[PDB]
Each structure stands twice: as structure tokens, then as C-alpha cells.
Amino acid sequence: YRARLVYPFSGAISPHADIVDQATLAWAAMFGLRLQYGLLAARAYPRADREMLQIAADWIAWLFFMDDQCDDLQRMIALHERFLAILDGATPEAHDCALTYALADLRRRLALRAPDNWLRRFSEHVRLYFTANRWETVNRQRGATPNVATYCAARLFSGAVYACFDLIELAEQIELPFYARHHSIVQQLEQAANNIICWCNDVLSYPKEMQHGDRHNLVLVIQGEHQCSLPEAIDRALDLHAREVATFVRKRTCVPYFDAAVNTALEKYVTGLQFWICANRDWSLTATRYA
Amino acid sequence: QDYRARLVYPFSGAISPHADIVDQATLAWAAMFGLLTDKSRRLQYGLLAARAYPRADREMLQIAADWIAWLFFMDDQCDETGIGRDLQRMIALHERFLAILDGATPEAHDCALTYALADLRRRLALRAPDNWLRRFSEHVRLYFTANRWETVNRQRGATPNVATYCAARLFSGAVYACFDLIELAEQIELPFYARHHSIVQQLEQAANNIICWCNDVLSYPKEMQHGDRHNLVLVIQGEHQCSLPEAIDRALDLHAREVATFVRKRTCVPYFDAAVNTALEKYVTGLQFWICANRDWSLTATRYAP
Numbered sequence: 001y002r003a004r005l006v007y008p009f010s011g012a013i014s015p016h017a018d019i020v021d022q023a024t025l026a027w028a029a030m031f032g033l034r035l036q037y038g039l040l041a042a043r044a045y046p047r048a049d050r051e052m053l054q055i056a057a058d059w060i061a062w063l064f065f066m067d068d069q070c071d072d073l074q075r076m077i078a079l080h081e082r083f084l085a086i087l088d089g090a091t092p093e094a095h096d097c098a099l100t101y102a103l104a105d106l107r108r109r110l111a112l113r114a115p116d117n118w119l120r121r122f123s124e125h126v127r128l129y130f131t132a133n134r135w136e137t138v139n140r141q142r143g144a145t146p147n148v149a150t151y152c153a154a155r156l157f158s159g160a161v162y163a164c165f166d167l168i169e170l171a172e173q174i175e176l177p178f179y180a181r182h183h184s185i186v187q188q189l190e191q192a193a194n195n196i197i198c199w200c201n202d203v204l205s206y207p208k209e210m211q212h213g214d215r216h217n218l219v220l221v222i223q224g225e226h227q228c229s230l231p232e233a234i235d236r237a238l239d240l241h242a243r244e245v246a247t248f249v250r251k252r253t254c255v256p257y258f259d260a261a262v263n264t265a266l267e268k269y270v271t272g273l274q275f276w277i278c279a280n281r282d283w284s285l286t287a288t289r290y291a
Numbered sequence: 292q293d294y295r296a297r298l299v300y301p302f303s304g305a306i307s308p309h310a311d312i313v314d315q316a317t318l319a320w321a322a323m324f325g326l327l328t329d330k331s332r333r334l335q336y337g338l339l340a341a342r343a344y345p346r347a348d349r350e351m352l353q354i355a356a357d358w359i360a361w362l363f364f365m366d367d368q369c370d371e372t373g374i375g376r377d378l379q380r381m382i383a384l385h386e387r388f389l390a391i392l393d394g395a396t397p398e399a400h401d402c403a404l405t406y407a408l409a410d411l412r413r414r415l416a417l418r419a420p421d422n423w424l425r426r427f428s429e430h431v432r433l434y435f436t437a438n439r440w441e442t443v444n445r446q447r448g449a450t451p452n453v454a455t456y457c458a459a460r461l462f463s464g465a466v467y468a469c470f471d472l473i474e475l476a477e478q479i480e481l482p483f484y485a486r487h488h489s490i491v492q493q494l495e496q497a498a499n500n501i502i503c504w505c506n507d508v509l510s511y512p513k514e515m516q517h518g519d520r521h522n523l524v525l526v527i528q529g530e531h532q533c534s535l536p537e538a539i540d541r542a543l544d545l546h547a548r549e550v551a552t553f554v555r556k557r558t559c560v561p562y563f564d565a566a567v568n569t570a571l572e573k574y575v576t577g578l579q580f581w582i583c584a585n586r587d588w589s590l591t592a593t594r595y596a597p
């Protein structure tokens with residue numbers, strides 16, 4: 001089943017991978033938060049300078065530490081409120097959670113690297129991530145059973161992949177005009193890449209999520225919808241992954257010609273989406289997390 | 292349990308950008324030569340090679356990755372199967388390998404590893420002069436000799452003292468054979484007088500010791516589990532009759548001391564001429580890439596996980 005997570009393109013890894021992974025474990029220790037999160041970041045942004053790769057690695061660590069620590073809606077609503085204050089630029093006062101201080105450091109370091117325009121886009125993607133998490137949490141407690149369409153539409157935001165795609169611009173040191181960033185084909189390539197990354201994860205993490213009574217997983221949602229066996233649910237999930245890869249590859253050639261400079265930056269951005277798709281698969285296949 | 296904090300080097304490694312592509316190509320090579328028996332996708336032997344030869348061209352890196360894979364496939368038979376306890380079977384196999392290293396063509400019913408070694412020999416012959424193949428072949432011969440010596444220890448239920456173990460370990464780990472590949476990876480030639488210089492040999496010895504003793508600390512659990520005692524931790528524990536934690540501390544102390552020796556001896560390389568000293572500084576950088584590669588890969592490799 002795992003062997004069927006395949007792409008017609010290949011990834012790359014930063015030569016700095018291990019130095020970043022060590023500095024991530026050092027960073028997590030400093031803020032009081034096996035793992036190899038730096039080796040995901042090193043594959044996801046393989047051309048990035050060491051300074052920018054380290055921010056991306058520390059951000060990716062934060063998301064995993066967040067996902068792990070959360071293991072109660074009133075408590076979740078309270079925490080998300082303040083994270084967003086930090087993201088928009090509120091000082092981490094006393095009695096703040098370790099994660100809040102860590103997020104304050106990431107915002108601080110990104111502010112040195114990116115314009116206000118970028119910080120807003122990143123912040124909005126993070127807000128939608130929190131919203132999607134609160135939605136999944138309610139479903140869990142209330143025992144709600146979302147269909148495949150609903151799960152997949154929510155999964156695009158619950159995985160925070162869009163926040164990670166925002167870092168591609170900083171890694172690649174590219175600027176895209178509003179009209180190119182928001183173009184329907186660019187959005188459809190981002191959606192395809194996000195679905196591929198999430199559905200790859202779901203196929204690899206379903207055993208983990210079954211054990212902990214979580215059903216927010218494509219294989220588990222497909223199983224419930226079709227009233228079918230686990231092997232058929234896995235087969236259906238990998239068919240959707242295969243179809244989404246075909247869709248990404250096809251739409252790559254549908255990007256309009258704006259001008260030389262804009263299309264150069266767009267080619268780098270889409271190459272960045274491919275690096276992230278391969279990074280997710282290459283990293284997850286080896287990761288202790290899904291063993 | 293975590294020894295990262297006690298395996299520190301004052302130099303850093305690097306990894307080839309093609310690390311994952313190289314590992315996938317190694318699995319295909321392994322499959323092609325029928326070396327995969329029974330989690331092939333978590334071996335990650337390409338990810339060690341990618342770190343050990345980080346600046347190598349994809350073709351030379353692929354030979355290095357397949358060679359490192361070959362050593363692990365071979366090693367697992369010796370260190371976990373009956374051939375490692377049968378000197379007469381080991382002598383028979385080594386005679387076939389040695390024939391192949393000299394350039395003999397594999398017979399129809401030579402074992403998978405013999406066919407695989409012949410492929411590596413052919414590919415190295417395309418990339419290396421005859422003098423190199425002789426140096427490589429001799430280091431591999433000493434590896435076989437050291438493994439037969441380990442086999443006799445397993446057979447007799449013997450444990451060597453620290454001095455004897457460490458002296459044998461420099462050959463049983465095949466690190467010198469892997470060091471030979473640095474020359475091809477970095478596309479350098481050293482003249483005989485530079486290659487054999489006392490200080491160059493002492494730097495290779497220290498680098499080899501560091502790699503083996505780092506491995507011994509990280510691999511003592513899986514080796515205890517198979518009843519193997521060819522491990523600095525287990526030999527120290529045998530000699531001093533001390534606790535396992537004391538043995539580990541003593542092993543990590545020797546590792547630290549060897550790192551210090553390597554770093555200080557770096558500055559003792561004589562000036563021969565511009566060309567040779569540029570090639571030697573490239574080579575010594577190569578030893579540092581290997582030292583880091585060994586630790587960086589081993590800390591996260593499934594091979595050394597409980």
C-alpha cells in the first residue's frame with residue numbers, strides 16, 4: 001500500500017539538513033517544548049539559505065508540538081485567541097504557554113524576513129488552521145461523522161499546509177503580484193499539492209489515529225461512508241491520491257503567460273510545491289511517527 | 292538512552308541534495324541482485340552514503356551507496372546468522388569474493404552477494420585506476436581476515452581485551468575501504484609518499500576509531516541481543532568487570548579522546564607542495580564528512596532503534 005505513494009517528479013534535500021535538525025531540537029529545548037522535524041524542513045525547502053530554512057524547521061516543529069500537546073473546546077478557543085494576538089504582534093506576557101513564547105519567536109524572526117503583506121497572508125492561513133482544528137475537536141466530542149467531501153474540504157485547512165506554502169516565497173526569495181498569487185490555476189495547483197500531502201499522510205497515519213480513537217483520516221472517513229473493508233478504504237484513498245497527482249501534473253501547463261519576471265517566479269513557486277509533495281512522502285515513509 | 296550530547300564534533304557534515312533518489316536507486320540495485328530477503332523501504336543505506344560523500348557526482352555517489360548497502364547485507368549474515376559462527380563456510384565465501392575482487396567472473400550458482408560484488412568491482416574499474424583497485428581490494432581482504440578472526444572468537448566463546456579488540460576493529464568495520472572511495476568522490480590523486488605519510492595514516496586511524504566507537508555505543512543493544520561481543524562497550528565491561536553504564540562512560544571517554552587526537556593531528560600534516568597539500572586538505576575534509584555522516588545517520592537510522 002505504502003509503495004503506491006508515487007510521483008512523476010522527485011525532490012531534493014538541503015545540504016544543511018542535519019545542522020538544522022540539531023538546531024530545531026536545541027530550539028525546542030530552549031523554549032521548553034526520534035523527531036527529525038528539521039529533515040522534513042530540509043526536504044520541503046531544499047534551496048533555502050540556512051537562516052530561512054531554520055525558521056521553517058522551527059515552524060514545522062511548532063506544528064508537530066501543537067498537534068502532540070493538544071492530546072475540550074472552551075480551553076482550545078482560549079489558546080487560539082492569544083496565538084493570533086501573538087501572530088498580529090502581541091507581546092508574550094507572563095503566564096503565557098511555552099508554545100505561545102515559541103510562536104512569538106517565529107513571528108519575530110519572520111517579521112525580519114517578510115513584508116506586512118506576507119505576515120497578513122501567513123496569519124490568515126494560521127487562523128483557518130485554528131478554526132479547522134476547533135471544528136474537528138467539536139466533531140470528536142459530539143461524535144460527528146463527516147462524509148468524504150466535508151472531511152477533504154476541512155482537511156485542506158486542518159493540516160496547516162497553506163501556512164507552510166507561504167514560506168516557499170521566503171525560501172525562494174520571490175515576490176508574486178496579487179493577480180498572479182490568486183490566479184485560479186495557481187490556487188488549483190496549491191489545492192492539489194495540499195490534498196496530495198494530506199491524503200499521503202492519512203494513508204500512513206491511519207493506524208496511529210485508529211489507536212487513539214481519531215477518525216479524521218481519509219481511509220477512516222471512506223470506510224464509514226462506503227461501509228467497506230479497511231483494504232478497500234485504503235485502495236479508494238490511494239486512487240484519490242493518484243488522481244490528485246494526475247490533476248497537479250496536468251494543471252502545471254495551464255499557468256497563463258503574465259510576463260518573463262512573473263512567470264519565472266511562478267515556475268519557482270510551483271517547483272516549490274513539488275519539493276513539498278516529495279518532502280512529505282520521502283520524510284513520512286522513514287519517520288518513527290508512522291512506524 | 293540519548294547519547295547525541297556525548298557524540299559532539301567541532302566540525303559539521305553535509306548531505307548530497309540527491310540523498311533520497313540515491314537510496315531509491317540502491318533498493319532497485321538490491322532487488323535486481325536479489326539481496327532483499329523479508330522493511331526494505333526503511334534501510335536508508337543511501338542516506339549514509341549521501342552524508343559520507345556529500346559533494347560526489349550522482350554516479351560515484353551511487354557506487355558508494357551500493358557498496359555501503361553491500362557491506363550491511365554481508366555484515367547482517369556474519370553478525371546475525373550461522374555463517375558468522377562457521378569459519379569453513381566463511382573461508383569458502385571469502386575465497387569467492389577475493390576471486391571476484393581480482394576480476395574473476397561469477398559462476399552460475401555463486402550467491403547473490405558474489406554477483407553484487409562483481410557489479411561493484413566492474414563499476415569501480417570504470418572510475419578508478421588499477422593502483423586504486425589494488426588498495427581497495429587489500430582493505431577489503433583485511434576486512435574478511437578481521438571477520439574470520441571475529442568468527443573464531445564467536446566459535447571459542449572468547450572476548451578479546453580492549454587493546455586487541457580496538458586493533459582488530461580498525462579492519463572488521465571496513466572503514467578503510469570506504470575511505471578509499473573519498474579519492475574517487477573528490478576526484479583527487481595523492482602521491483605514494485603523501486598517502487602513506489605517518490600523520491595521514493594517524494588521521495585515517497583516528498577517523499576510523501571515532502566511527503567504530505560511535506557505532507559501538509549506538510549498536511551495543513542490538514549486538515548484546517544477538518550475543519555478539521565485538522563492541523568497545525562490551526569488551527571494556529569484560530576487561531574491567533564493571534557495570535554497563537560505567538562501560539558506556541569509558542567508551543564515550545575514549546571516543547572524546549580520539550576526536551581530540553584527530554583535530555590536533557590535522558595541524559601536523561607537512562607541506563609537500565601546493566597541489567599535494569590541496570589534495571590532502573580535501574581528503575582530510577572527506578574524513579570529517581565520514582565522521583559526521585556515521586553519527587548523523589546512526590542517531591536517526593531504524594537499524595539502531597530499539
Ligand SMILES: CC(C)=CCC/C(C)=C/CC[C@H](C)CCOP(=O)(O)OP(=O)(O)O
Pocket residue numbers: 060063064067158159160161164197198201205280289
Ligand atoms: C502537524 C502539522 C499540522 C503539520 C506538520 C507539517 C506538515 C504540513 C506535514 C504534512 C503532514 C500532514 C499535513 C500533517 C497534518 O497533521 P496530522 O495531525 O494529520 O499529522 P500526523 O498524522 O503526523 O499526526
Ligand SMILES: CC(C)=CCC/C(C)=C/CC[C@H](C)CCOP(=O)(O)OP(=O)(O)O
Pocket residue numbers: 359362363366370463464465466469502503506507510585594
Ligand atoms: C556494515 C559495514 C561493515 C559497514 C557499513 C559502512 C560503515 C563503514 C559504517 C560505519 C559504522 C560501522 C563501521 C559499521 C560496521 O560495524 P558493525 O558490524 O558494528 O555495524 P552495525 O553496528 O551497524 O551492525
Ligand SMILES: [Mg+2]
Pocket residue numbers: 201202205206209217
Ligand atoms: Mg494524520
Ligand SMILES: [Mg+2]
Pocket residue numbers: 067209214
Ligand atoms: Mg493527528
Ligand SMILES: [Mg+2]
Pocket residue numbers: 366367370
Ligand atoms: Mg553488525
Ligand SMILES: [Mg+2]
Pocket residue numbers: 506507510511514
Ligand atoms: Mg556495531
